[PDB]
Design a protein around this ligand. Structure first.
Ligand SMILES: [Mg+2]
Ligand SMILES: [Mg+2]
Ligand SMILES: [Mg+2]
Ligand SMILES: [Mg+2]
Ligand SMILES: [Mg+2]
Ligand SMILES: [Mg+2]
Ligand SMILES: [Mg+2]
Ligand SMILES: [Mg+2]
Ligand SMILES: [Mg+2]
Ligand SMILES: [Mg+2]
Ligand SMILES: [Mg+2]
Ligand SMILES: [Mg+2]
Ligand SMILES: [Mg+2]
Ligand SMILES: [Mg+2]
Ligand SMILES: [Mg+2]
Ligand SMILES: [Mg+2]
Ligand SMILES: [Mg+2]
Ligand SMILES: [Mg+2]
Ligand SMILES: [Mg+2]
Ligand SMILES: [Mg+2]
Ligand SMILES: [Mg+2]
Ligand SMILES: [Mg+2]
Ligand SMILES: [Mg+2]
Ligand SMILES: [Mg+2]
Ligand SMILES: [Mg+2]
Ligand SMILES: [Mg+2]
Ligand SMILES: [Mg+2]
Ligand SMILES: [Mg+2]
Ligand SMILES: [Mg+2]
Ligand SMILES: [Mg+2]
Ligand SMILES: [Mg+2]
Ligand SMILES: [Mg+2]
Ligand SMILES: [Mg+2]
Ligand SMILES: [Mg+2]
Ligand SMILES: [Mg+2]
Ligand SMILES: [Mg+2]
Ligand SMILES: [Mg+2]
Ligand SMILES: [Mg+2]
Ligand SMILES: [Mg+2]
Ligand SMILES: [Mg+2]
Ligand SMILES: [Mg+2]
Ligand SMILES: [Mg+2]
Ligand SMILES: [Mg+2]
Ligand SMILES: [Mg+2]
Ligand SMILES: [Mg+2]
Ligand SMILES: [Mg+2]
Ligand SMILES: [Mg+2]
Ligand SMILES: [Mg+2]
Ligand SMILES: [Mg+2]
Ligand SMILES: [Mg+2]
Ligand SMILES: [Mg+2]
Ligand SMILES: [Mg+2]
Ligand SMILES: [Mg+2]
Ligand SMILES: [Mg+2]
Ligand SMILES: [Mg+2]
Ligand SMILES: [Mg+2]
Ligand SMILES: [Mg+2]
Ligand SMILES: [Mg+2]
Ligand SMILES: [Mg+2]
Ligand SMILES: [Mg+2]
Ligand SMILES: [Mg+2]
Ligand SMILES: [Mg+2]
Ligand SMILES: [Mg+2]
Ligand SMILES: [Mg+2]
Ligand SMILES: [Mg+2]
Ligand SMILES: [Mg+2]
Ligand SMILES: [Mg+2]
Ligand SMILES: [Mg+2]
Ligand SMILES: [Mg+2]
Ligand SMILES: [Mg+2]
Ligand SMILES: [Mg+2]
Ligand SMILES: [Mg+2]
Ligand SMILES: [Mg+2]
Ligand SMILES: [Mg+2]
Ligand SMILES: [Mg+2]
Ligand SMILES: [Mg+2]
Ligand SMILES: [Mg+2]
Ligand SMILES: [Mg+2]
Ligand SMILES: [Mg+2]
Ligand SMILES: [Mg+2]
Ligand SMILES: [Mg+2]
Ligand SMILES: [Mg+2]
Ligand SMILES: [Mg+2]
Ligand SMILES: [Mg+2]
Ligand SMILES: [Mg+2]
Ligand SMILES: [Mg+2]
Ligand SMILES: [Mg+2]
Ligand SMILES: [Mg+2]
Ligand SMILES: [Mg+2]
Ligand SMILES: [Mg+2]
Ligand SMILES: [Mg+2]
Ligand SMILES: [Mg+2]
Ligand SMILES: [Mg+2]
Ligand SMILES: [Mg+2]
Ligand SMILES: [Mg+2]
Ligand SMILES: [Mg+2]
Ligand SMILES: [Mg+2]
Ligand SMILES: [Mg+2]
Ligand SMILES: [Mg+2]
Ligand SMILES: [Mg+2]
Ligand SMILES: [Mg+2]
Ligand SMILES: [Mg+2]
Ligand SMILES: [Mg+2]
Ligand SMILES: [Mg+2]
Ligand SMILES: [Mg+2]
Ligand SMILES: [Mg+2]
Ligand SMILES: [Mg+2]
Ligand SMILES: [Mg+2]
Ligand SMILES: [Mg+2]
Ligand SMILES: [Mg+2]
Ligand SMILES: [Mg+2]
Ligand SMILES: [Mg+2]
Ligand SMILES: [Mg+2]
Ligand SMILES: [Mg+2]
Ligand SMILES: [Mg+2]
Ligand SMILES: [Mg+2]
Ligand SMILES: [Mg+2]
Ligand SMILES: [Mg+2]
Ligand SMILES: [Mg+2]
Ligand SMILES: [Mg+2]
Ligand SMILES: [Mg+2]
Ligand SMILES: [Mg+2]
Ligand SMILES: [Mg+2]
Ligand SMILES: [Mg+2]
Ligand SMILES: [Mg+2]
Ligand SMILES: [Mg+2]
Ligand SMILES: [Mg+2]
Ligand SMILES: [Mg+2]
Ligand SMILES: [Mg+2]
Ligand SMILES: [Mg+2]
Ligand SMILES: [Mg+2]
Ligand SMILES: [Mg+2]
Ligand SMILES: [Mg+2]
Ligand SMILES: [Mg+2]
Ligand SMILES: [Mg+2]
Ligand SMILES: [Mg+2]
Ligand SMILES: [Mg+2]
Ligand SMILES: [Mg+2]
Ligand SMILES: [Mg+2]
Ligand SMILES: [Mg+2]
Ligand SMILES: [Mg+2]
Ligand SMILES: [Mg+2]
Ligand SMILES: [Mg+2]
Ligand SMILES: [Mg+2]
Ligand SMILES: [Mg+2]
Ligand SMILES: [Mg+2]
Ligand SMILES: [Mg+2]
Ligand SMILES: [Mg+2]
Ligand SMILES: [Mg+2]
Ligand SMILES: [Mg+2]
Ligand SMILES: [Mg+2]
Ligand SMILES: [Mg+2]
Ligand SMILES: [Mg+2]
Ligand SMILES: [Mg+2]
Ligand SMILES: [Mg+2]
Ligand SMILES: [Mg+2]
Ligand SMILES: [Mg+2]
Ligand SMILES: [Mg+2]
Ligand SMILES: [Mg+2]
Ligand SMILES: [Mg+2]
Ligand SMILES: [Mg+2]
Ligand SMILES: [Mg+2]
Ligand SMILES: [Mg+2]
Ligand SMILES: [Mg+2]
Ligand SMILES: [Mg+2]
Ligand SMILES: [Mg+2]
Ligand SMILES: [Mg+2]
Ligand SMILES: [Mg+2]
Ligand SMILES: [Mg+2]
Ligand SMILES: [Mg+2]
Ligand SMILES: [Mg+2]
Ligand SMILES: [Mg+2]
Ligand SMILES: [Mg+2]
Ligand SMILES: [Mg+2]
Ligand SMILES: [Mg+2]
Ligand SMILES: [Mg+2]
Ligand SMILES: [Mg+2]
Ligand SMILES: [Mg+2]
Ligand SMILES: [Mg+2]
Ligand SMILES: [Mg+2]
Ligand SMILES: [Mg+2]
Ligand SMILES: [Mg+2]
Ligand SMILES: [Mg+2]
Ligand SMILES: [Mg+2]
Ligand SMILES: [Mg+2]
Ligand SMILES: [Mg+2]
Ligand SMILES: [Mg+2]
Ligand SMILES: [Mg+2]
Ligand SMILES: [Mg+2]
Ligand SMILES: [Mg+2]
Ligand SMILES: [Mg+2]
Ligand SMILES: [Mg+2]
Ligand SMILES: [Mg+2]
Ligand SMILES: [Mg+2]
Ligand SMILES: [Mg+2]
Ligand SMILES: [Mg+2]
Ligand SMILES: [Mg+2]
Ligand SMILES: [Mg+2]
Ligand SMILES: [Mg+2]
Ligand SMILES: [Mg+2]
Ligand SMILES: [Mg+2]
Ligand SMILES: [Mg+2]
Ligand SMILES: [Mg+2]
Ligand SMILES: [Mg+2]
Ligand SMILES: [Mg+2]
Ligand SMILES: [Mg+2]
Ligand SMILES: [Mg+2]
Ligand SMILES: [Mg+2]
Ligand SMILES: [Mg+2]
Ligand SMILES: [Mg+2]
Ligand SMILES: [Mg+2]
Ligand SMILES: [Mg+2]
Ligand SMILES: [Mg+2]
Ligand SMILES: [Mg+2]
Ligand SMILES: [Mg+2]
Ligand SMILES: [Mg+2]
Ligand SMILES: [Mg+2]
Ligand SMILES: [Mg+2]
Ligand SMILES: [Mg+2]
Ligand SMILES: [Mg+2]
Ligand SMILES: [Mg+2]
Ligand SMILES: [Mg+2]
Ligand SMILES: [Mg+2]
Ligand SMILES: [Mg+2]
Ligand SMILES: [Mg+2]
Ligand SMILES: [Mg+2]
Ligand SMILES: [Mg+2]
Ligand SMILES: [Zn+2]
Lengths: 64, 53
RNA sequence: GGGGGGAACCUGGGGAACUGAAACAUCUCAGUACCCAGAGGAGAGGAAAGAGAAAUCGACUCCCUGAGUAGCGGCGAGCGA
RNA sequence: UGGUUCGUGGAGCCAUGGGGGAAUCUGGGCGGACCACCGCCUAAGGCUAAGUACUCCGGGUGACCGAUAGCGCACCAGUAC
RNA sequence: GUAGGGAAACCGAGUCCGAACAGGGCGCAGCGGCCGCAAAGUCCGCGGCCGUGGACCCGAAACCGGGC
RNA sequence: GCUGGGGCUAGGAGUGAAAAGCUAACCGAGCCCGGAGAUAGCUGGUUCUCCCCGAAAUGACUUUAGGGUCAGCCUCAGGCG
RNA sequence: GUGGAGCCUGGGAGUGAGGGCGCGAGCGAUAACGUCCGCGUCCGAGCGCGGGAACAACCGAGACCGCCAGCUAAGGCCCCC
RNA sequence: ACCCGGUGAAAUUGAACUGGCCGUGAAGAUGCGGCCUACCCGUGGCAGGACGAAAAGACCCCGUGGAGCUUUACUGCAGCC
RNA sequence: UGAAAUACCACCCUGGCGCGGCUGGGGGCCUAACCCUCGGAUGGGGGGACAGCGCUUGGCGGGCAGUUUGACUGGGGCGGUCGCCUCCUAAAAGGUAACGGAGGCGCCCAAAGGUCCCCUCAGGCGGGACGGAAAUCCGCCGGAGAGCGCAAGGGUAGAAGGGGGCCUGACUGCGAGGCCUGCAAGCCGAGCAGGGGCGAAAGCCGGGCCUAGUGAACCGGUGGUCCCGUGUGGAAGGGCCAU
């Protein structure tokens, strides 16, 4: 039977034009009152997942 | 943070938006904080007041 | 006129668990296995109190596709129009 | 409560076990809570070929088996035991 | 497959954050003599590995259904 | 009290002067067939030949510790040089 | 310094029970064929070969095949030899 | 039991051309070293050894294995209010 | 005449009364639903709108069901431990184990933060009413042995220590380049722009001398935004930024 798209991955991650995998920095969901502004700000960007981890996530997204 | 050392937000007094989170001791510092801060909405420093987190 | 039989198939009335979730309860397995009733050479469905955005289509059934999309989901495992 | 992708979700729709309970086209249901507008459709009676499923049965055909294989059984086998 | 960026509206070789014409993230740009050659890509075959299936074979103790 | 014949009560059920006894020669939940090829991070087994290379038994994390993910270490193909 | 060196992209792993020895420590008793780390080695996978009486890891030395040829290594040269 | 006539099993079994000591070896050697001893083959007997046979240790631990039982573990259900 | 003023007719209040409708709660009685029972049954007797039974509410509930009941460990249990910081072990880069040797953290500070300016310690001897080993004062010596909120370590008076003035940079938008590193995290950060603080200026300031003072994701709350809104306009609900 065909592979199914993993919905937690589709909801967290995007495959870029060249196939890198991109996700939001973790760590400002909460407990933020004492975090610096440099911290909150920097966690507000996307980062590019480490190759071996991205490579795995990419396989769960067979039809993007 | 503790029961006595609380977290609180600082609200811009001109446009009413909370722009900063910080902390204080409410035994040592019972009056509501008033601090001049840069409001990114207003694009200028503005007296901000402690408002409940 | 009925009754009883018929390998699979079919509808309806009931309906598990192992298992998976690398534990488990929701979830899954699965409306499956199985019991029961009923039909018949098929059965079911069928002639819009429909679809759903087109100023549209035009009963139902069956195949391809739409699409593992939309969504659903201890937003987990998975499920899936 | 079930059905739907929908696990209570903003949860409509279809169905209905309990309670309440109308109207007959100026009636009613629907387009995903609700309201308006704009549209779609006519519930609470019934039937309806074909295209579809199956293989006990008959036949055709195998880059299928060839007696430890192939059906459990090539043979008097659902037998002896 | 031929466009990406953005939660989205949306814009588009850009776009997102941003007040920014700042900075940054993610993106955009063949060979020979018009000819041929190669190629994005995509289709089919073959092979390796992966996912779903009992998924390399054999083995529980057990659980559940219906019967005896 | 013992005993013949004829009967009734069974599977989370019977029956028990109670031993978790007995319910067709193994009962802390009977047997048969089915779900079913349950599951088994465990044990075992894994079949012709030559040729080249050739490990690991560590780190991090892990209801993890005799299992995994990543990394380290082996090998192949392409590129660099 | 041209090596089964190195770097880059990718495909496939296996491993994630180690062990002895030397040196440096901790633990232990300045015990263990003890235990736990570090550097190194070997066995693992070199239970193939010589020496060590025998003997994975001590000494010698990395077995492509053949020879009734030569030189050596550790160790040996009285007889077993 | 033994001898002669008749009939004639069994578990077990890698193969066997299957001695003692002192050593060595995965730490209890017929199978390795050195020694000692020993002609070939049986019959009746004994049980020290072949870590003899049987039974994939029942103790112990391990498995995010099972099952019976308990309760002011969790969560539900019958039942009762 | 007071706020409003008088006879008389209304519409409506404050509170109360009696009639009535419509009802909720209790008490009594009835009979015919419903239940029981009676040789006799379209009836009699008894219970009686209770009980039973349907739907729904909340509760009690090992009677039963499904399960859960951690790991490390010189076997397991028992005890102890589990994250983070500091020192040692650690073999002079980094790293490095043991149920090895010792201690700390889970806070705090509106100043204990920024900046400008000023100041310098502990301790010893001598001197000085109450006054002491040690209160405050004077002299000399005294480089740091004191201080630095808390453990330890590193650092440090050419201040990070102590005092004062003005202040809120305990910034918003970013961020070259690195440390560390399996991942994810963690860490440092020049510079540019906006709007500020201190300073004459040079300049400093994106919390604290430093290293602990912490928690991914899921689900949800609140403020903002005004991005999506199931034919359409809204709305429901979501996204996004902040927490
Ligand atoms: Mg976050
Ligand atoms: Mg979170
Ligand atoms: Mg948030
Ligand atoms: Mg939130
Ligand atoms: Mg801080
Ligand atoms: Mg932090
Ligand atoms: Mg900050
Ligand atoms: Mg802040
Ligand atoms: Mg597609
Ligand atoms: Mg694409
Ligand atoms: Mg019939
Ligand atoms: Mg019939
Ligand atoms: Mg059915
Ligand atoms: Mg029926
Ligand atoms: Mg049913
Ligand atoms: Mg059925
Ligand atoms: Mg059942
Ligand atoms: Mg289950
Ligand atoms: Mg299964
Ligand atoms: Mg699975
Ligand atoms: Mg499971
Ligand atoms: Mg499992
Ligand atoms: Mg279990
Ligand atoms: Mg389950
Ligand atoms: Mg399954
Ligand atoms: Mg189901
Ligand atoms: Mg079937
Ligand atoms: Mg029939
Ligand atoms: Mg037909
Ligand atoms: Mg028909
Ligand atoms: Mg019909
Ligand atoms: Mg009609
Ligand atoms: Mg498509
Ligand atoms: Mg999810
Ligand atoms: Mg389903
Ligand atoms: Mg309903
Ligand atoms: Mg449902
Ligand atoms: Mg929802
Ligand atoms: Mg719904
Ligand atoms: Mg109804
Ligand atoms: Mg009408
Ligand atoms: Mg109407
Ligand atoms: Mg309707
Ligand atoms: Mg309706
Ligand atoms: Mg409607
Ligand atoms: Mg409609
Ligand atoms: Mg319609
Ligand atoms: Mg019909
Ligand atoms: Mg026809
Ligand atoms: Mg038909
Ligand atoms: Mg046919
Ligand atoms: Mg045939
Ligand atoms: Mg033939
Ligand atoms: Mg034969
Ligand atoms: Mg046969
Ligand atoms: Mg033959
Ligand atoms: Mg036959
Ligand atoms: Mg036969
Ligand atoms: Mg026969
Ligand atoms: Mg750009
Ligand atoms: Mg760029
Ligand atoms: Mg091609
Ligand atoms: Mg693969
Ligand atoms: Mg299968
Ligand atoms: Mg298979
Ligand atoms: Mg496979
Ligand atoms: Mg099996
Ligand atoms: Mg059993
Ligand atoms: Mg069970
Ligand atoms: Mg059971
Ligand atoms: Mg049964
Ligand atoms: Mg039964
Ligand atoms: Mg009798
Ligand atoms: Mg009898
Ligand atoms: Mg009897
Ligand atoms: Mg009985
Ligand atoms: Mg019985
Ligand atoms: Mg029975
Ligand atoms: Mg049973
Ligand atoms: Mg029980
Ligand atoms: Mg049972
Ligand atoms: Mg019983
Ligand atoms: Mg008895
Ligand atoms: Mg007992
Ligand atoms: Mg039997
Ligand atoms: Mg018996
Ligand atoms: Mg049982
Ligand atoms: Mg029995
Ligand atoms: Mg059966
Ligand atoms: Mg199954
Ligand atoms: Mg199977
Ligand atoms: Mg299991
Ligand atoms: Mg095989
Ligand atoms: Mg080699
Ligand atoms: Mg290990
Ligand atoms: Mg390791
Ligand atoms: Mg860690
Ligand atoms: Mg980890
Ligand atoms: Mg394991
Ligand atoms: Mg790997
Ligand atoms: Mg290498
Ligand atoms: Mg190459
Ligand atoms: Mg080369
Ligand atoms: Mg090599
Ligand atoms: Mg190599
Ligand atoms: Mg590789
Ligand atoms: Mg391969
Ligand atoms: Mg592996
Ligand atoms: Mg392994
Ligand atoms: Mg391991
Ligand atoms: Mg080991
Ligand atoms: Mg080791
Ligand atoms: Mg090693
Ligand atoms: Mg070890
Ligand atoms: Mg060593
Ligand atoms: Mg030496
Ligand atoms: Mg040593
Ligand atoms: Mg040491
Ligand atoms: Mg001694
Ligand atoms: Mg040795
Ligand atoms: Mg050792
Ligand atoms: Mg030693
Ligand atoms: Mg030692
Ligand atoms: Mg070693
Ligand atoms: Mg090995
Ligand atoms: Mg060697
Ligand atoms: Mg080697
Ligand atoms: Mg050797
Ligand atoms: Mg040898
Ligand atoms: Mg060898
Ligand atoms: Mg040797
Ligand atoms: Mg030798
Ligand atoms: Mg020798
Ligand atoms: Mg020759
Ligand atoms: Mg010579
Ligand atoms: Mg020599
Ligand atoms: Mg000699
Ligand atoms: Mg001799
Ligand atoms: Mg004789
Ligand atoms: Mg005889
Ligand atoms: Mg022999
Ligand atoms: Mg002999
Ligand atoms: Mg020895
Ligand atoms: Mg011996
Ligand atoms: Mg011998
Ligand atoms: Mg020999
Ligand atoms: Mg010997
Ligand atoms: Mg000998
Ligand atoms: Mg002798
Ligand atoms: Mg004898
Ligand atoms: Mg004996
Ligand atoms: Mg004996
Ligand atoms: Mg022996
Ligand atoms: Mg013996
Ligand atoms: Mg034995
Ligand atoms: Mg044996
Ligand atoms: Mg077994
Ligand atoms: Mg065993
Ligand atoms: Mg055992
Ligand atoms: Mg036991
Ligand atoms: Mg044990
Ligand atoms: Mg156990
Ligand atoms: Mg567990
Ligand atoms: Mg485990
Ligand atoms: Mg278990
Ligand atoms: Mg159990
Ligand atoms: Mg009772
Ligand atoms: Mg009365
Ligand atoms: Mg009466
Ligand atoms: Mg009456
Ligand atoms: Mg009465
Ligand atoms: Mg009542
Ligand atoms: Mg009734
Ligand atoms: Mg109610
Ligand atoms: Mg209830
Ligand atoms: Mg229980
Ligand atoms: Mg309970
Ligand atoms: Mg289960
Ligand atoms: Mg538990
Ligand atoms: Mg648990
Ligand atoms: Mg238990
Ligand atoms: Mg647990
Ligand atoms: Mg354990
Ligand atoms: Mg112990
Ligand atoms: Mg262990
Ligand atoms: Mg140990
Ligand atoms: Mg021990
Ligand atoms: Mg041990
Ligand atoms: Mg304990
Ligand atoms: Mg410990
Ligand atoms: Mg922690
Ligand atoms: Mg060190
Ligand atoms: Mg050191
Ligand atoms: Mg070091
Ligand atoms: Mg060193
Ligand atoms: Mg490093
Ligand atoms: Mg001050
Ligand atoms: Mg300070
Ligand atoms: Mg100051
Ligand atoms: Mg002094
Ligand atoms: Mg004095
Ligand atoms: Mg005095
Ligand atoms: Mg004094
Ligand atoms: Mg000091
Ligand atoms: Mg302290
Ligand atoms: Mg001022
Ligand atoms: Mg960077
Ligand atoms: Mg990193
Ligand atoms: Mg300035
Ligand atoms: Mg500025
Ligand atoms: Mg100025
Ligand atoms: Mg700066
Ligand atoms: Mg401080
Ligand atoms: Mg601090
Ligand atoms: Mg979750
Ligand atoms: Mg979770
Ligand atoms: Mg949320
Ligand atoms: Mg709308
Ligand atoms: Mg809008
Ligand atoms: Mg709508
Ligand atoms: Mg309007
Ligand atoms: Mg609009
Ligand atoms: Mg409004
Ligand atoms: Mg809203
Ligand atoms: Mg909103
Ligand atoms: Mg956010
Ligand atoms: Mg922001
Ligand atoms: Zn403002």
């Amino acid at each position: 039977p065909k592979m199914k798209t993993h919905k937690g991955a589709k909801k967290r991650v995007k495959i870029t034009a060249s196939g890198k995998v991109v996700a939001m920095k973790t760590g400002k969901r909460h407990l933020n009152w004492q975090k610096s502004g440099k911290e909150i700000r920097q966690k507000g960007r996307k980062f590019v997942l480490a190759k071996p981890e991205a490579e795995r996530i990419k396989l769960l997204l067979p039809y993007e | 943070a503790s029961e006595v050392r609380i977290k609180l937000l600082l609200e811009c007094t001109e446009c009413k938006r909370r722009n900063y989170a910080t902390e204080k001791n409410k035994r040592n510092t019972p009056n509501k904080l008033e601090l001049r801060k840069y409001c990114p909405w207003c694009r200028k420093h503005t007296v901000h007041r402690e408002v409940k987190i």
